Amino acid sequence: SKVTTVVATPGQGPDRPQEVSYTDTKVIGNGSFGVVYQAKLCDSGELVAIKKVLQDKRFKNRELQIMRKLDHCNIVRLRYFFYSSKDEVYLNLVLDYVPETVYRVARHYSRAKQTLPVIYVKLYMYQLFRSLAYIHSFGICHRDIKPQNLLLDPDTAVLKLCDFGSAKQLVRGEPNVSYICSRYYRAPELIFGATDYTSSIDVWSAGCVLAELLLGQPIFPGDSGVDQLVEIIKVLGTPTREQIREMHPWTKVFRPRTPPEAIALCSRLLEYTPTARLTPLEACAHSFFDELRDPNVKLPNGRDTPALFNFTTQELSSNPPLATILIPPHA
Numbered sequence: 001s002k003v004t005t006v007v008a009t010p011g012q013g014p015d016r017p018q019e020v021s022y023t024d025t026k027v028i029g030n031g032s033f034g035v036v037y038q039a040k041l042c043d044s045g046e047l048v049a050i051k052k053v054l055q056d057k058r059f060k061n062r063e064l065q066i067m068r069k070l071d072h073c074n075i076v077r078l079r080y081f082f083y084s085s086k087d088e089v090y091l092n093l094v095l096d097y098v099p100e101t102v103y104r105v106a107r108h109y110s111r112a113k114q115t116l117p118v119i120y121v122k123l124y125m126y127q128l129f130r131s132l133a134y135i136h137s138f139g140i141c142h143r144d145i146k147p148q149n150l151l152l153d154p155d156t157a158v159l160k161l162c163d164f165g166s167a168k169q170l171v172r173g174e175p176n177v178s179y180i181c182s183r184y185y186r187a188p189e190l191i192f193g194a195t196d197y198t199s200s201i202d203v204w205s206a207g208c209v210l211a212e213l214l215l216g217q218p219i220f221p222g223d224s225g226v227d228q229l230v231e232i233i234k235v236l237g238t239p240t241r242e243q244i245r246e247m248h249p250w251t252k253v254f255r256p257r258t259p260p261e262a263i264a265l266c267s268r269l270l271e272y273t274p275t276a277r278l279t280p281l282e283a284c285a286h287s288f289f290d291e292l293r294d295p296n297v298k299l300p301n302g303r304d305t306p307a308l309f310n311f312t313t314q315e316l317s318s319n320p321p322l323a324t325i326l327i328p329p330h331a
């Protein structure tokens with residue numbers, strides 16, 4: 001077994017490097033992002049993911065700057081970072097390992113001609129909304145919400161948002177690129193080429209993930225923006241002049257046994273008007289998640305549900321009175 005020893009800087013806290021040794025290094029992902037590895041830390045025995053990207057000499061890495069300041073139970077944790085080396089330098093992000101993704105779990109169910117039990121749809125969606133409530137409180141927009149970027153530990157039912165390669169602090173009056181976000185999950189303002197969009201593009205993407213988990217397939221597919229806009233229009237109806245300036249019965253969209261609270265939540269996330277969409281914190285508070293607030297709720301495997309109510313002042317800052325719903329009496 002090959003052991004690699006590096007001098008890495010801890011993610012959170014002041015810049016004080018340490019020797020870090022890891023082994024059992026294997027490639028687990030390859031794409032436009034770069035390469036993701038799996039490895040075992042020699043000291044603790046803990047599994048880690050290592051995202052390796054090409055580092056520009058000219059500037060500081062935006063993903064690293066964002067990740068160093070994030071601390072949330074539903075966001076993948078940056079343990080360390082280090083630089084490595086023809087004649088080019090790479091930035092390596094040592095993250096907490098999470099074994100599965102919502103993409104892979106949902107695909108197991110789709111191929112088996114079935115849908116993910118609604119208890120999981122609530123757990124995953126609720127935890128995704130918490131992660132968005134947290135990043136959005138600092139003005140940070142993920143800009144790439146999709147099932148592959150939603151990590152899962154299937155045994156504990158914990159969801160962790162990953163991939164901050166497109167994330168950016170959105171400042172009012174500053175223009176932003178419209179070519180971020182993956183096909184199927186782009187908000188209609190991004191399809192229309194808006195550069196003045198807000199963090200609500202993340203809420204639309206999350207609404208696309210929710211509808212997909214309920215349906216067993218993407219709600220707005222299409223290989224072009226015009227095809228995707230046709231699928232959006234089939235469900236939401238034709239956008240008014242006011243709606244276009246700002247950027248079908250929903251019950252007939254899903255299978256008959258679909259909970260009406262789930263359908264009501266989709267209609268409030270998937271709206272043409274960016275300001276009409278729910279905020280992540282308001283989505284957390286929706287009646288679709290009431291089952292998670294029940295003191296007797298348990299996972300299908302018999303275990304207790306993960307931490308769902310440990311809200312901080314920062315997390316609640318968008319609407320502090322929502323704490324009366326969000327933190328139930330038993331919590």
Ligand SMILES: C[C@H]1CN(c2ccncc2NC(=O)c2ccnn3cc(-c4ccccc4)nc23)CCO1
Pocket residue numbers: 028029030033036048049051076095096097098099100101148149151162163164165
């Ligand atoms: C294909 C991968 C791409 N991947 C990413 C794309 C861009 N930047 C980062 C990541 N990954 C991560 O930040 C990440 C952090 C922690 N644990 N972890 C496990 C796995 C994983 C990798 C392969 C198969 C299953 C799981 N990926 C991660 C997201 C998942 O799907």
